[PDB]
Design a protein around this ligand. Sequence first.
Ligand code: HEM
Ligand code: HEM
Ligand SMILES: [C-]#N
Ligand SMILES: [C-]#N
Lengths: 123, 130
Amino acid sequence: PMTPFEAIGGEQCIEILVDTFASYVSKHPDLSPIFPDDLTETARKQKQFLTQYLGGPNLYTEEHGHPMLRARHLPFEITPKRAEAWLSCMEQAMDDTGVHGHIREFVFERLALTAQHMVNTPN
Amino acid sequence: KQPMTPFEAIGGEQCIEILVDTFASYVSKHPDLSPIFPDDLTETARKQKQFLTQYLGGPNLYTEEHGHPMLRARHLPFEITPKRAEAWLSCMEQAMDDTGVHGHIREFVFERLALTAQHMVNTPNETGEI
Ligand code: HEM
Ligand code: HEM
Ligand SMILES: [C-]#N
Ligand SMILES: [C-]#N
């Protein structure tokens, strides 16, 4: 024991985490313009990626191949301000789904680092 | 008579401490690598030492603290190109040279590490690399 995926609560917790996150993303002025109007598909892939990243089944790469995550974000203007907005929505999502304690810090530190890596545009 | 574990054969903790500290120095200077690593590699180095210790047959310091390495999953968000894997291995080679790691243990460790690096690659090659 115990993968971050099991510690965070498994599929059930990822489901609601990402559903709540997508809701906040869709309502954030800094993010809603660059995401799809319908985030269903986006959220489906976010669940895949977070699942596989945190030690669950290899959902994302089994369907979409190599993650190449920064490259998939290149077509979008991802500014430091937008990275902040993203993490701000993940923070609220984790608060709303009960993700606390060491797993919260573990996951958020790694997504904050990842979000920094996605930045491809100055403010 | 017990053969040495690979971790013993390389010189144990004192070697792994020196090798990783040296490696992380090269990493932080490598233009292909430093952008994606944290600015302060101290936590990364601490984890690398723990990983490599158990990776080579020492105690399970990494798994006991962090859980299963699952390194391909843990590297999923990071832009790991074939080039950056070679840079990684290049810094390890230089680090091994600086720390005195030679012989069968060096080739055993490097060849295993070269397999792991290739498995971390999660971004296609760039133009000219086909
Ligand atoms: C730094 C701020 C970020 C912004 C502004 C951003 C924005 C976006 C946008 C607009 C898309 C397109 C969605 C679609 O076409 O369906 C996308 C895709 C995606 N993003 Fe993010 N993102 C950010 C960071 C992250 C982070 C930290 C992760 C960590 C897991 C992540 C994982 C993904 C995944 C898995 C996809 C699906 C890619 C695909 O297969 O098409 N992103 N992102
Ligand atoms: C192939 C080129 C590689 C690149 C570019 C690379 C890059 C990175 C980066 C940017 C991180 C994030 C640092 C952090 O969050 O602390 C990381 C974490 C890590 N890497 Fe690598 N890596 C590579 C290969 C390897 C190899 C070959 C090994 C082991 C033999 C390894 C073991 C680790 C470990 C244990 C961690 C810490 C994960 C954690 O517990 O958070 N990596 N790597
Ligand atoms: C990406 N959210
Ligand atoms: C990884 N270093």
